[PDB]
Design a protein that fits this description.
Two copies of one chain form a homodimer. By secondary structure, the first copy, chain A, is an alpha+beta fold. The first copy, chain A, has 14 helices and 43 strands. Helix content of chain A is 16%, strand content 34%. The complex binds a molecule of 2 linked components (NAG-NAG) (3 copies) and 2-acetamido-2-deoxy-beta-D-glucopyranose (6 copies). Chains A, B: One of its GO terms (cellular component) is basal part of cell.
């Protein structure tokens, strides 16, 4: 009865609710009621008990909580204060469940940067002022583990900037051994890496400088040391450095992830600074020296002949119940990424998945089953169904649990498992209204709808949503998957303006069977624009040829493939060849810009939000992974060839609107500053917009402002 | 016939020349020829010769020269490198003009700040790395005066940032005594003053950070010390601090200016930080104790009971031939600034000029003559003629040299007097094409035309310029002078969009009979826009009821007076009220914003280039002068009330265009960053533009862009 309105989108009127059980055992989870009460629901009995009242929570206005594995204590986390994507500080009030009171001995210090329970019992490890601390018991005086922490120079047990956003994707870098015997932790040195400096205008009379150690392409990188201390004899034995494989130590390198096996066995993944080689390292504990031994025989190489080791990140092993063998997804001989099963050497791995489709994530490995997500089903690469396979004996049996569960509503699934995988939740994201459901571990049968989104279902019932369709184009030897969003009563005999939404980042996939009533949904609903999104070269989950196509040649095929798609769309007949725009954020901004400046005639305008503008300016770990090194005898020539600044002249005849946040710690305002300056030097008009103090996300009312500004631009561009 | 173009204005096609004799005696001046030779002209004798060859200058590719008082040497300036507005860095070679080769040996150091000769002989004084050095013969080894010089921290003989822009308005802060027996310099200590920090993106991989000790409103000011040193025997006694007057030392104080009356007499001017009182001090070298003495009987208080002490700046004294008494422009008893002759006391002063107008500048005091510029001719505040009055003889005489020199073509004059005022040059700037002429000045007779501007006179023949008109409005006891620029073939009956150019800064004057082919000319010539510039309250040269009316109420009355004017312009009947814009720069961008957010629905749109947004962010010197202090006791409340941020809401339904250069060291980008931040927080769309690495001037290819971008805006706004 009525079209989406921009305020529907910016108020989240039609957001959906998800449900990920905060497991505490094989059969129990800790949700938070509408009453704000924190309830423990036992799945087997069906009984619900409330552990942690709204009141107790409110008394320290905690925004969050954490049960100790022994249920004796629960920490309440408050004064939440954000930093980067994942990191944040908080104050922590720990609470004694048995005595129903807060714990009084030696209060924890304020701003704590990370804190977690041990995996069993109720030991604490925390990070305060860049050092790791240990508590045997909630109310004890802390034991200092590291002493050399220093505000962005040296980090213990939390990453620095580059490792947070680009390697770990995690706010922490310490891992308890399975039963708490040991803590393993990373030490990052940022001391002589260059610094990104920018202004934050804040609220005072004087702006301040913000400085983050931030290794730009080719710049000097952080150095890592991984240590493990005995958690019961930390002073007696002291921290022991995990030995680094010779073929990793021989040049710059990275730690990529750590995975515990047993308490006496740890798996370390390294990545050579030239990131086409990954090493997996399995170390065992010696008792005679109380130290770690990593034998050559337990070093596993993973190479990429024609690209980079991994997908976006290296795959991590998930180990068998036996705690010797492991499973890992990587490229097979055909260039498709599949699950392999590894006992002794990696040269001997047995491939247990295969086909022109990819194993995307291994969720769980039990005694008999392995649960994983994949795009196999009906061979749409942008779907996620979750599958199980038998692991006891060759040929694995295969069951797609999700495929036909709700065939039409749900073709994009993630999974979350309870302990021992006694039960798991399935979360379907689309194409229909998302749904979270509870499933039996042994049988796969659903035992509870968790979140059905009845409100949304019903709120959407008066709203004439745009029609999404996902399809494919074969052009050369290259196939292009595309989502097309279309206005209600899309009369094909008429010519609609087209908007291309681009991202195109290496390892991305932007064409997905996901549900989202969003901005580009609204532009079709009310504004009469056709919207399209195109996955081509460098996009993932279709094998290595397509993935690694853009290696060292960034911002070439991405541009090419978008233009191709657009050409093919205008040729479909229903697209106003005179009203095509393109808009893109981050990597999207790069390609939005390179596309619009391609001397193609196709695009009449384009928008670039927080674009990279030259790989010189972006972080090493990301850039070098795809671009290699900006040296003269590596890849400097394409580093210089691939800026948007060089396209300076080709803006003269298109509307450009260029947007950026002045406090982007990830894609630096520098990027758009250089673009703007280049347009100025080439004497080219454009529209621009800064967001003071705002960062890469463009949060709060920025977002509001952002979309209102782009909407205006866009409505202008389509007269 | 043809209308003006943006190209015309941006190219400087219709720019004009000027002729200021570079005097070297009472009858000789040096000027650079068309084919770049430096030639000595004499007007007493009418002879010329090439004092410095064309190719000797190109031998070091210098761009400036400096002939010594004894004509034995000239300085040659190459490697000019701009710091701020007046400050710059250069290389100095000395040409032995007696021998016909360069001076070798004790070669001057690289990047020297400021350099100059004595007014007698050819002794050198220069500042290198913030420290004063002194030379006896141009080839002698330098004698260091100061030692405490530190980049960005201690400044000897040159100013810190705020003293340069806001106090002294000059690259230098050293002065020779008239015969060069002594040397006076300033010590500026910036140490404890907060730095302002901004990014400079440059061309390197990482931007760098620029810091400038910059005191914003109410912050820690620089401390000043002024010293005097014997030039002949500096080894003997060393540098001597000239006493600070008791009332001045009582609290915070600036050094306003220093003038030398004789070699044993010196004038110093001080400004109490609360700038309503200033103290003129005269000091004598006492022979016995070899230091300087300032009798408190020779302290002459100038205070204001209504506003700030002085004009824009405190006015300097011009001393009569007896080297004791002086002539100084200041507020008479009725509030109009006029010349006074102070013989011995302030109360004992005799008023020399009087009436409803202002003596703007004293140019020369002779044995029997005084030359001053004035507001007087036909009650027109917007033009300046030059007046000659007798002194020392009875039947007093007043002659206006220029009032009828060229009545219709020249009403805005300045003067350049040779030594002993033997000959003077007249430069007229409007309303017609500027022209520079040479005069006798015992007789005032015009001897010849130095710069006629026939190139410009002729090039403007193809061009239909707009009709300019400076009229005035009378409204509610307060009158407002204006200049209206009208389109060619202006139809009195038709209706025209109206653009207002606004500045409004206290002590300023925007309406002037000055020839200027500039942006607004183009917009009237081609675009059909009626333009108006209005001087209201806070505007100088019409006495103190006008000038001081803005004291402590900044932004209030100036906004109000553009509104009253616009309103009157509307009821003139040829202005389309639906199409009105206002635009400004610096202060002009402050009031344009405020006028646009006036909530009076008069302006459809407005542009603010590099606006001040809150007096909290601007330099102390300028700010406190007109605002007082931002404290509990003083004016805080109105610093608080008078920002643009506070008016964010009122922007909802106007078109705002906000422009600012990210390297603006004078009005910091923080100003525009905070307006932007406010508008977002209020959910108000607007247009913005930043200029990377550009300062307050927006010079270079940035100008093109800015002026192009703005006229796209107005054009669209006036669609
Ligand atoms: C350098 O100076 C010489 C001498 O003034 C210039 O040569 C003269 O050029 C003009 C025409 O511009 C002729 O009328 C003269 O006959 C030339 N005189 C001599 C001595 O050759 C020369 O043009 C100047 N070069 C520069 C830098 O412009
Ligand atoms: C905090 O938790 C308590 C405990 O359940 C809530 O108290 C109930 O509120 C409902 C509805 O307002 C009342 O009808 C009941 O009398 C209360 N107890 C029950 C469940 O029967 C309280 O509403 C919660 N809300 C907050 C944040 O204060
Ligand atoms: C300015 O510089 C002078 C020397 O020319 C210096 O004495 C002033 O204050 C000093 O600052 C020092 C460094 O911060 C400090 O250690 C010292 O105690 C202090 N001197 C005095 C007299 O106490 C500098 N100015 C300011 C405002 O501090
Ligand atoms: C905003 O969101 C809430 C809940 O999603 C909804 O009830 C409300 O009607 C929405 N509309 C606005 C703009 O407030
Ligand atoms: C951190 O790096 C610096 C400079 O490379 C070095 O001197 C210092 O010892 C390092 N600290 C360690 C090893 O934790
Ligand atoms: C760099 O720019 C474009 C990429 O689109 C390409 O056509 C051109 O040949 C390239 N030049 C170099 C240096 O290889
Ligand atoms: C720029 O200025 C030069 C010198 O005055 C003039 O000859 C030229 O015509 C101007 N503008 C253009 C059209 O390039
Ligand atoms: C400024 O000076 C006046 C006298 O001219 C005095 O009344 C006042 O105290 C000063 N300003 C303040 C602090 O109000
Ligand atoms: C990366 O390792 C490969 C092995 O596939 C090797 O040939 C190559 O020299 C290395 N560097 C790159 C990026 O070429």
């Amino acid at each position: 009865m009525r079209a989406l309105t921009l305020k529907d989108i910016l108020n989240g009127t039609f957001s959906y609710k998800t449900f990920f059980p905060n497991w505490i055992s094989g059969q129990e989870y800790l949700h938070q009621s509408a009453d704000n009460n924190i309830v423990l629901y036992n799945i087997e009995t069906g009984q619900s008990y409330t552990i942690l009242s709204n009141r107790t929570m409110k008394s320290v206005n905690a925004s969050n909580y954490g049960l100790s594995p022994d249920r004796q204590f629960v920490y309440l986390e408050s004064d939440y204060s954000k930093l980067w994507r994942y990191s944040y500080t908080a104050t922590y009030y720990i609470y004694d469940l048995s005595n129903g009171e807060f714990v009084r001995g030696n209060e924890l210090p304020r701003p704590i940067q990370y804190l977690c329970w041990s995996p069993v019992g109720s030991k604490l490890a925390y990070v305060y002022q860049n050092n790791i601390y240990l508590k045997q018991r909630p109310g004890d005086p802390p034991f200092q583990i590291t002493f050399n922490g220093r505000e962005n120079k040296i980090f213990n047990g939390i990453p620095d900037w580059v490792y947070e956003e680009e390697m770990l994707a995690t706010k922490y870098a310490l891992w308890w051994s399975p039963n708490g015997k040991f803590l393993a932790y990373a030490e990052f040195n940022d001391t002589d890496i260059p610094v990104i400096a920018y202004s934050y205008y804040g609220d005072e009379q004087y702006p301040r400088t913000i400085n983050i150690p931030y290794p730009k392409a080719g710049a000097k990188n952080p150095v890592v040391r991984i240590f493990i201390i005995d958690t019961t004899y930390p002073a007696y034995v002291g921290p022991q450095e995990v030995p680094v494989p010779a073929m990793i130590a021989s040049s710059d390198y990275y730690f990529s992830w750590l995975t515990w096996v047993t308490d006496e066995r740890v798996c370390l993944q390294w990545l050579k600074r030239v990131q086409n080689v990954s090493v997996l390292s399995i170390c065992d504990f010696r008792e005679d020296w109380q130290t770690w031994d990593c034998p050559k025989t337990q070093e596993h190489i993973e190479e990429s002949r024609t690209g980079w080791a991994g997908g976006f990140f290296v795959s991590t092993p998930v180990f068998s119940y036996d705690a010797i063998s492991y499973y890992k997804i990587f490229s097979d001989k055909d260039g498709y990424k599949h699950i392999h099963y590894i006992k002794d050497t990696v040269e001997n791995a047995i491939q247990i998945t295969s086909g022109k489709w990819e194993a995307i994530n291994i969720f769980r490995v039990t005694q008999d089953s392995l649960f994983y997500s994949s795009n196999e089903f009906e061979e749409y690469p942008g779907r996620r169904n979750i599958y199980r396979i038998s692991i006891g004996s060759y040929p694995p049996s295969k069951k797609c649990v999700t495929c036909h569960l709700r065939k039409e509503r749900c073709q994009y699934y993630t999974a979350s498992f309870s302990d021992y995988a006694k039960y798991y939740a399935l979360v379907c994201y689309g194409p229909g209204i998302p749904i979270s459901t509870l499933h039996d571990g042994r049988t796969d049968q659903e035992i509870k709808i968790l979140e059905e989104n009845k409100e949304l279902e019903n709120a959407l019932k008066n709203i004439q949503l745009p029609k999404e369709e996902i399809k494919k184009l074969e052009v050369d030897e290259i196939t292009l998957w595309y989502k097309m969003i279309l206005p209600p009563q899309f009369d094909r005999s008429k010519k609609y303006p087209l908007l291309i939404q681009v991202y195109g980042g290496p390892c991305s996939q932007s064409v997905r069977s996901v549900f989202a009533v969003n901005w580009i949904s609204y532009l079709a609903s009310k504004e009469g624009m056709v919207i399209a999104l195109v996955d081509g070269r460098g996009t993932a989950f279709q094998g290595d040829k397509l993935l690694y196509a853009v290696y060292r040649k960034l911002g070439v095929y991405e541009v090419e493939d978008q233009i191709t798609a657009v050409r093919k769309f205008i040729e479909m007949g229903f697209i106003d060849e005179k009203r095509i725009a393109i808009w893109g954020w981050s990597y999207g901004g790069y390609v939005s810009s390179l596309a619009l400046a391609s001397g193609t005639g196709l695009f009449k305008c384009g928008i670039a939000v927080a674009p990279v503008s030259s790989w010189e300016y972006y972080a090493s770990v990301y850039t070098e992974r795809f671009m290699g090194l900006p040296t003269k005898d590596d890849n400097l020539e394409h580093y210089k060839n691939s800026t948007v600044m060089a396209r300076a002249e080709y803006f003269r005849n298109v509307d450009y609107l260029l947007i950026h946040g002045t406090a982007d710690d990830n894609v630096h305002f520098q990027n758009s500053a250089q673009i703007a300056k280049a347009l100025v030097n080439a004497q080219v008009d454009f529209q621009a917009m800064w967001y003071s103090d705002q960062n890469h996300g463009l949060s709060g009312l920025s977002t509001n402002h952002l979309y209102t500004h782009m909407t205006h631009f866009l409505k202008q561009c389509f007269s």
